[PDB]
Amino acid sequence: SHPALTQLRALRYCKEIPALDPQLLDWLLLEDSMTKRFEQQGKTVSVTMIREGFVEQNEIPEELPLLPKESRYWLREILLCADGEPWLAGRTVVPVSTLSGPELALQKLGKTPLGRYLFTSSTLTRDFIEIGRDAGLWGRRSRLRLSGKPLLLTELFLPASPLY
């Protein structure tokens, strides 16, 4: 895609959680997206849509092993901005079995930034979180569940974000 997405795809991982300082970890291990925390920075948070739509197994080689093997998945790539400055690149992969009931919202977000705040009757849990990095930036990937249905969320923190 975009330069930020190339970096997101180039993250080198581990849930081999590094011994980072309290604050960095508090950020990287957050069991939610960054939307509300970026908002508390006193900024208007918005989504710059790079692309999203359904994809099949042959377009998701790296996520594939982390997800159930299905006929299609919703793929969503965006830049999360604070007063128009990209602060994070987000890539979400949702197996189609997850896209139903309240979780059907995940393929319907569009310009709405993802967050636990959006699913008020859905319990959010997390199978795992791993921290990665590339080119001087921290990123992370996690397998989350809403009402028990999985989704893979990968996030890369850009220089202007508050993690730095």
Binding-site residue positions for substrate = 34, 76, 114, 155
Q: Which residues are annotated as a binding site?
A: 34, 76, 114, 155
CB 74 within 8 A of CB 107: yes
CB neighbour class for 48 (10 Å; exposed up to 12, middle 13-18, buried from 19):
middle
8 Å CB contact between 154 and 99: no
Q: How many CB atoms lie within 10 A of CB 40?
A: 9
Q: Look up residue 70 and give its DSSP letter.
A: -
Q: How far apart are CA 144 and CA 103, in angstroms?
A: 12
AA letter at 33? S
Rounded distance, CA 118 to CA 35, Å?
Answer: 11
